[model samples]
Every structure is written in C-alpha cells, then in structure tokens.
Target: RTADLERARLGDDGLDFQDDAAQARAFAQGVFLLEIPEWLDLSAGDRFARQFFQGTGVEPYGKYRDLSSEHFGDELLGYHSRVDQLEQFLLERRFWGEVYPSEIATLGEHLTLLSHRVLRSVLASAGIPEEDWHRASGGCSETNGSYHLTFNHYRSAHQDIGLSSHKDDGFITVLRTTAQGLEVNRDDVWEKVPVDPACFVVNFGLSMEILTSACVTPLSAIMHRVSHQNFDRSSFGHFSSSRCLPGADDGIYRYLPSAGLERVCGSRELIEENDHEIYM
Candidate 1:
C-alpha cells in the first residue's frame, strides 16, 4: 500500500507521501495539494470553522486581527499562538467570541502532529538518513521551539489584491483553506490552487529550501499570494521553524552558509516579533 500511495497522482482525491522520488519532484515545484484521510481528520477543522464563523458575526469587527489593510472592512481576523499554547486560546476567549478554546486547541494539536510527519517525509525525500533526521530537522519537535498555528478569517471581500506575493520563511506551511483565492507563482506565471474540500495545500518555505539546497534535487520555496476572493474565506496555517538560531554552528547549518543564515534569520526574527506581539 505504501507503493500504491507513492504512485498516486498529484492533486488527486486521495494522495499520500510515500515516494521519495515523487516527493522530491513535487518539492522542486514548491507546492502540492494533498488529501491524507488516515492522518488528517478534518472533522475538528469543520467544527472549528462552524464555530468561528458563528462568532465572526458577533465578535465585532477588528477584534482579533493579526493582519490589517488600509481598507476599513478588509481587516483579516487572525489568531496566532505556539503549537502547544492551548492556554492562550482560553485566555483570549473574549476576542474569540463564541469559539471555544477546545475547538482551536484540538485542531492545533492535530496540525502540529501533521507538521512533524510532513517534515520527516520532506527530510526523507532529501536523502537525509534516519540517524541524521534529528540533526537535519534543526532541532525541530512538537515541544521544541515556537511552532506556530494561526487561524485566519477574511470577512470582507475586496476586488483588489488580498495579500501581496511573498515566500514563507519557515520550513514548511501546511494550509487548509475554505475557499479558492490563493495563487502560486509557477515558472513566472501565476496559477490558481484548486479548492478541494478534502485536500490541504502544502508548500515549501525558505528554511526547507536552504536546508536541501545541496541535495541531488534541491527544493524551491514557491512564492504565493491571496487574490481577490470577492467572498469570505478562512484558513488554518501551521508554521514550523528550527529550534536553533539561524547562524548556529550545529551540523544542521552544514548546508547553509553564513549568507544563507543571515537571510534566514532576518525574516524569521520579524515574524517572531510581529506574530508574538499580537499573540501576547
């Protein structure tokens, strides 16, 4: 069955990450759509979504926003916290309105687990042996460092660009979005990511690209952005990062030179500062 899943076509209804070669190829392209029913039980996600929207109506505008725009109504409602910070959700229930802490907590924990599995798969695809998996992961683990779980709800619809183009600075971002306003840059042309209720959009980030740069087939971090949805959209994003500093002399930095480390640290610190401020 492993081989069966390994050979499954990309963007199919049921897809798994069992093939190193196929995974490497997909990584080269920087993004892939996946549906892993066994590991991903989106019922928690559905429950959270149902409750989140219920609260959106009564949560008041600009209640818990992490990202805002010049427009008054286009403020993106967001909640950011560490993967293990369940208490943060409860403490901020006033901002969450009807949504309970357990709702976000359950889904956050599940996605954090999913992030580890996905990271291990990516390391395997990069030919990192099991013994070195720990090192290559840059001290990443569920409890280590500040792995991020963010909830985003775009309540207002604008015909203009929703978010500008940028590459994620983490190792990988596992995104489960409710609608189809996301577009990724593919070979200089923008392509729309299809909306499949059962699928999650996985994309490589700068950290993964730098870590695997010297591999047989290096991975590329694709640039993506949100287009005008003209309708409400919601998503859950799990961001994974290295536990060690960017310029640490650990073996994890063997593939990353000083220049690469500088680049990695620059974006990461910004995200940590901004997101942490809002989270606190």
Candidate 2:
C-alpha cells in the first residue's frame, strides 16, 4: 500500500503545475498527485466527517447502512454547486446549520479553488486555446458551476471494495482521504494509489476525456476504486464539470461536446443506471 504508482506527485514544494510540460506529463498518466499547502488544514474534513456520522437525522439524506454484504460500506453527503450553495444546503437544515457551516465553509472554498487550478492545467495541456477553454468551462466560476463535493465516511473496516470502479463524469475530481485504499487501473491492473494526510489525488473523468479527444491526442479518464481497510475512513471528492454546449454543424465543436448531447452522456447513463450514487 505504501508503494507509489507514478512520479505524479508535485513531489515537494519545488515542482508545481505551473510548468506546462511537467503538468501535462503528469496528467498523461491520468492521475496527478498533489501536495496540499500548509494553509489548508485537512483535519477540517475529518471533523466534518465525525460530526456527520455521529449526528442524528443524517440518515435521511445521502446516508447508507448495512451494506457490507453487498460490498458497499460508505455513508455519503453530497453538496453541489459552489461553497455558497453548500452553505445554503446546510443552513436550511437545523442540525447541519448549527454545526457544519462554520466547520466546512472555509475548507470548501480552498478545495474548490484547488479543483479549478487542476482543471485549468488539464485543458491547457490538451492544447485547447484559452478562449475555447473559457467558453467551454466558464473559467469554472461559481455561478456557471457544476461542482459536486462529497463527504464520504466509512464506518467499518472490511476487505471489500470501499467504492466501485468507474470513471468520474466531470472534467476532473480532486480527492482527499484519511486512509490508503485508493487504487487506479493501469494497463487493466488495479494498483494502489499513493495517499497521505499531506497530499491529494487528482484524476481526469469522462467529460475531460471527451473534450481532449475531440481536440488532440486524448488523455484517458482513469478507472479507479477503493478497497476497504481494517479501520474507519473519511474522504472528500470535489468534482468539477465543463459547461456543456452544442457543437457546431460538423457534429463536433472543433474540440467541445454539444450542449444537450455528447458521448459523455453514454458514460453518465451507465453510471446512473448502475446506481453509482449509492456507492461513491
């Protein structure tokens, strides 16, 4: 579990996503590991997870129970849009409003920005023009956003899949976890993805694969899953999507998917059909 998968890590403070070549090379592997800056205290996610699982009435929302026999054992809470939207969702609920807002608001802000930066690098590396990138993604601004943030709490430790394997539907997913079961598919082999309290794992999803494929040599969307540990786990996934729009007359917008229709939907449909919401 301690073995690293690739040289994808920001590695330390010296290397960064700022260098287009380095960023693209790491991105080519479809899984880029990054170091969390000192300012963003990752423990905030652990605190939020603790309160959520122990709190009352959380079962009615995105919670799951007694499913280890079926190989699913994680309880989740989904927060969409931007940080402000997350605040609104929590504020409307009594217990969530009283305890969660203050604890998670700032954390969400930092994570959201991180997701944006990762997305920018992914697009820039694909050789997408700045203008087209902005048009397709609205610069990942809050108002035109489709951010999906999940609070995943694994209550028990079993030797089962913590999360089923599937490609994410968004452009990129930035993940942080308290345990070490994350794994990625490389050459059809499922290998453990390296993780620590100080770093994050960033991966491309279906929408990104589709976008880049339409533009230049495509980057594959990673197929990944998590295996449960002998201990409890807590993780956060912040997913960002490009603004879907109609392609020009050629049925392809030079390098973008159409507004109402695109190949991305095929993956989306399969994910939904399999009830992915119940798993991860």
Candidate 3:
C-alpha cells in the first residue's frame, strides 16, 4: 500500500512498518526500499560472497568502480569488478592474469535473468516484448557489453562515510550488504537503511528511470551512500544496464528504448570522454 506519507505505517518500513517506506519516502525525499525473498539461489551468492572476502585480483589501478577513471579516492578503495556471462568470449574488464571462476559467471547470468524477469512488467506495460528487452539491454553479447552481476569488497575504512553519495547506472540494483552502512537520502538528511541477512534491497538506477521516460526518474535513481566503519564488508550487486555500445556511425547512439527516447547522440565511450557530457 502506498499509504499516506504522514501515516504510521511507513515509519516501520521493514517486514513490519519500514518493510518498504519507499513510496512514502519517495513522496518525501525521492527514495524507496524493496525487500525480496532469498530465493535467488545461494549457490552463487554464497560462492561469490566467500570469494570476495579472501580477495584475489590486480588492485584496481583504473578509475570509476575502482577500475575506471572517475570516482572516490583510493584510500577508501574497494575491489570491485564485473562478472561477465560464462562463455568463450573475452571481457572488457576481465582481471587479466587472474582466473574468475565459472560459477561466478553463471551467478551473474542468474541475476541478469532474474532482474530482467522482474522488469518484464515495465516492458509489457509499455507494449514491448520480453525478448526485445535483452536486445535493448545488450548484455551477454560477446563483443561489446556489460555485466549482469558484480561484487563489492568494501574493506575496513575509518570515516563517517564509506562511499560518497552517488547514483547507480543500471536498471535496478539487487544488493545484499553485510552491514547497515547503506543509507538513503531522506529530506536532506542521511537516514540509515537497516540491513538484515534475510532480504535483498532493490533500488532503481538511472537508466531504469530513463527507460520509463522520466516518469520514474530522480525518485528511482535516489542518492545513496555507504557508511564508513572499521569492519570489512562483503556485498554483491546485480545490475541490468541499458543497451549500450562504444560508438556509432554518427556521433549518436541509442542506449535506452522508450516512447520518449528511441535514440540519443552519444556513445558509452564518448560520454566518459566529453567530461561525461551525455545529451540523452
């Protein structure tokens, strides 16, 4: 129930009250929370979680996501990477010299399908076909694509903020954090989003909002951050991003599909280069 924001029900938005104060909070501060069953299979969740704790990969020497060119400082660094779908193709960000397990790749695929399945409603509601969704998403493509599942190994860092506030790039985030560090922006104040081992947090990302033609925007891609503490935190997140490519014939590329946006004039590679100036 998207009850009145001033109601007593939203206070405890958990399985009880706060089980989901999303809409109420969205009405107030443009952020909401979702809790889903633990049914996504621990086969990979357990395996991936166990692997991130020990850790083994070249220290991310790149930038954003700790591997690219834009993001927080390295002092509060965490080892993050994308798990490509299991296949014989090479990945854009595969940790060279380090072997990623097959199970991990499969895990990513599982979350990819799960997330895709979850959003079928949006596509169907838009009069789009389910099969068309993947083509529009451009994942699992060997030559040019992104990951379905990713990992975050947030080690112990001492500060009030572990990660500076930011937004995500996928359609939705399916996350399981080991601690209560995840916080959402609530009325210009940062409120702690309680954590539990029994449920996953599903937050909307920018492209998901974009795919809906701004009707779901800003609210879905709510500002969020991680709290800093002296404890190592292991977490897993699944991302379903817009269909993207590095370049296009013209200076234009289409990443997301919706009635409002059938095409945009910038490629993935072009965006990060032009000060990340996206014209979509």
Question: Please, what's the RMSD in Å of model 2?
Answer: 8.5
Q: Alpha carbon lDDT of residue 39, candidate 3?
A: 52
For candidate 1, write residues 182-202 as lDDT tens digits: 788867878777776666788
Point out where model 1 deviates above 4 Å: 1-21, 38-100, 129-131, 141-145, 155-160, 244-267, 270-280
Error of 3 at 119 (Å): 1.8
* Model 2 accuracy (lDDT, Cα): 0.54
Enumerate clash totals for all models, in the order shown: 0, 3, 16
For 149-222, candidate 3 gives per-residue lDDT tens digits of 55555545343345557666655566766566778764566777766555566665555444454333223466
- 1 or 3: which has the higher lDDT? 1
Better of 2 and 3 by TM-score: 2
Candidate 3: worst-modelled 10 consecutive residues by lDDT: 82-91
Q: Please identify which of the two predictions, 1 or 2, would achieve the higher TM-score against the true structure.
A: 2
Consecutive 10-residue window with the lowest summed lDDT within model 2: 83-92
Q: What would the TM-scores of all predictions be?
A: 0.66, 0.68, 0.59
